[PDB]
Amino acid sequence: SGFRKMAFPSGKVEGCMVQVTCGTTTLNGLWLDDVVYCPRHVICTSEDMLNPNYEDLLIRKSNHNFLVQAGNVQLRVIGHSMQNCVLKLKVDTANPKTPKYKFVRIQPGQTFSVLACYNGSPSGVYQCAMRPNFTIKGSFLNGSCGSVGFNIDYDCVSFCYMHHMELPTGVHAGTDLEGNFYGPFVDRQTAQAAGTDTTITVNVLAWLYAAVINGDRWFLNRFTTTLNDFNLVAMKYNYEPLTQDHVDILGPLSAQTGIAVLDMCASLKELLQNGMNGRTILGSALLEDEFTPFDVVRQCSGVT
Amino acid sequence: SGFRKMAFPSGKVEGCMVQVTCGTTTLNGLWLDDVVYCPRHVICTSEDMLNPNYEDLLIRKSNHNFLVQAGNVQLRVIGHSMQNCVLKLKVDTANPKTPKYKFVRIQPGQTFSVLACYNGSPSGVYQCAMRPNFTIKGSFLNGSCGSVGFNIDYDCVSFCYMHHMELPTGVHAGTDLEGNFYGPFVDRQTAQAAGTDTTITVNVLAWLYAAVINGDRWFLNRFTTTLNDFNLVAMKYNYEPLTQDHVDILGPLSAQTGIAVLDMCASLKELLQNGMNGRTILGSALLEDEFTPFDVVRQCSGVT
Ligand SMILES: CC(=O)N1CCN(CC(=O)Nc2cncc3ccccc23)CC1
Ligand SMILES: CC(=O)N1CCN(CC(=O)Nc2cncc3ccccc23)CC1
């Protein structure tokens, strides 16, 4: 029993983190096989960030200008290329610690672990989610760029995020490992405002199921609702619309607890309208939305 | 910017986790040098747990009854001994992945990372704290015993906790790596109720300083207080008394923000008396107490 915001074990990813320096800037790179992936803004000066022409700036860079260090040993760069907003630095040595891996592009609502790094060295690990506005709420200081987000499926690491930017509002933006930004964000120091950060309804429901499984049941009520009625309330509270696909995804949790998905929706509807009244659910005074249904089943079943 | 409940990178500890089986029970062990540490209740049947005589039960066990597996390879047990509530299984092979380590006994209020494991395999990592009632609020299923709590200081892992028990109220109890339980708990299936789970005041203050550093400033007010006046309010709200030692520990955060510790105490006093009014601080609707002052400085400075 108990339910925590749990990250995946970070060891497999720690074995891939390297330091990348271009000129005076140092950030992190991800070393998989004989390729080091990093944000292309490593080539920029602070002046360049205002309106960078990355193809033009990259012409002035050679393999020997990209300093890649793995621990205290230098890697030899034998090629470089730009793929969207990431650089791929080909090195002469395959990472001996390369885990089984995949590059995946996640959807909003999906969670992942982040291994925050500075100078190619891991500082900490935390869990977050791709927000519906395509930002993430991370913990990143200067030097953290190139830190990655991932999920693990037994022994395969699915990398889904690489950190690139902090917006003026303190929220974060980045790319998948193909270098495509999530959402409309760009790697430029310009006015980029995020859209509405709606709540991930299917994840809140999953977390209410985790609460019931772990003994917190005070919020269960005598009501039910329909998807359409629930969605009228969800729209009012800036919650994402619940679809029949979400109801199907919640099936295993509904079966485990014996609480029909629409009955849990009615409990969530009352919590939205009535508030918590100073009470807590799984140690939280707000409705938590950064656990997917898969995360809840995984944590409640002890998948390793 | 941003502030997350961050755990230490778990790789160094993943390299130490093994499976320990005695009879029909399988739990986790911690392999450091040529010793595997695990809960002594691995020798118990479910009937034994009601009133176990561990010295007597251990007489019936030989080295060959303790099956220790590291990954898919078996370790040879050449000795066994009981130290308080842990067993130390001497193996014929030193763990080649043994990090620099220490065994420390933490005080209530101190935080640590837990690497939840099942069958010697890591499932996830999360952050928690030694509660003032000597319980921890973890996420542990059957099979998780022997999972450990730790802190890292650059390359030295300080192990502080080994998981042993879940109380009937869903909270957790365990030992340090010398086998001494935190608090009054015992490794017996008996009536063990926890005391008051008071809030760790110095940690709440540290987290309010993290909120100011990360831009959440709405709770700052025009007031100040004294330690004695603040403590009258803290006692009323089941908060731990704040001492001058806590004020001294908060010095670096006070210097960073320019907010005197007693002024922050006055902000905390108003939040306790007035509530949050539906507002949030660092994405929380309650006052968070599982970040120590050291955690706040570490996260806000990017220590690796
Ligand atoms: C060349 C240059 O000045 N830069 C700085 C800006 N960066 C982009 C950028 O947004 N970086 C950062 C990302 N995350 C957290 C951050 C905290 C603090 C400061 C910068 C952060 C490009 C490279
Ligand atoms: C021999 C035996 O039956 N046991 C079981 C009890 N254990 C003690 C015990 O409290 N274990 C557990 C610890 N943490 C989470 C847990 C969730 C679910 C169940 C058991 C948990 C001794 C060994």
UniProtKB/Swiss-Prot annotation, chains A, B:
The signal sequence is: none
The reaction(s) this protein catalyses:
TSAVLQ-|-SGFRK-NH2 and SGVTFQ-|-GKFKK the two peptides corresponding to the two self-cleavage sites of the SARS 3C-like proteinase are the two most reactive peptide substrates. The enzyme exhibits a strong preference for substrates containing Gln at P1 position and Leu at P2 position
Recorded superkingdom: Viruses
Give ranges for the Cytoplasmic compartment. Answer: 1-304
Question: Could you tell me which residue ranges the Peptidase C30 domain spans?
Answer: 1-304
For this chain, the site of the Glycyl lysine isopeptide (Lys-Gly) (interchain with G-Cter in ubiquitin) cross-link is 5, 90
How changing residue 145 to A affects the protein?
A: Complete loss of 3C-like proteinase nsp5 cleavage
Task: Explain the regulation of its activity.
Answer: Inhibited by pyridone-containing alpha-ketoamides compounds 13a and 13b. In turn, alpha-ketoamide 13b (tert-butyl (1-((S)-1-(((S)-4-(benzylamino)-3,4-dioxo-1-((S)-2-oxopyrrolidin-3-yl)butan-2-yl)amino)-3-cyclopropyl-1-oxopropan-2-yl)-2-oxo-1,2-dihydropyridin-3-yl)carbamate) inhibits SARS-CoV-2 replication in human lung cells. Inhibited ex vivo by michael acceptor inhibitor N3. Inhibited ex vivo by compound 11a and 11b.
Q: Where in the cell is it found?
A: Host cytoplasm; Host Golgi apparatus; Host nucleus
Q: Which residues form the active site?
A: 41 (for 3cl-pro activity), 145 (nucleophile)
Subunit composition? 3CL-PRO exists as monomer and homodimer. Only the homodimer shows catalytic activity. Interacts with host FBXO22; this interaction promotes the proteasomal degradation of nsp5.
What is this protein's function? Answer: Cleaves the C-terminus of replicase polyprotein at 11 sites. Recognizes substrates containing the core sequence [ILMVF]-Q-|-[SGACN]. Cleaves and inactivates human TRMT1, preventing tRNA guanine(26)-dimethylation of tRNAs. May cleave human NLRP1 in lung epithelial cells, thereby activating the NLRP1 inflammasome pathway. May cleave human GSDMD, triggering alternative GSDME-mediated epithelial cell death upon activation of the NLRP1 inflammasome, which may enhance the release interleukins 1B, 6, 16 and 18. Also able to bind an ADP-ribose-1''-phosphate (ADRP).
What name does this protein carry?
Answer: 3C-like proteinase nsp5
The shown chain, on whole-protein numbering, covers 3264 to 3567 of 7096
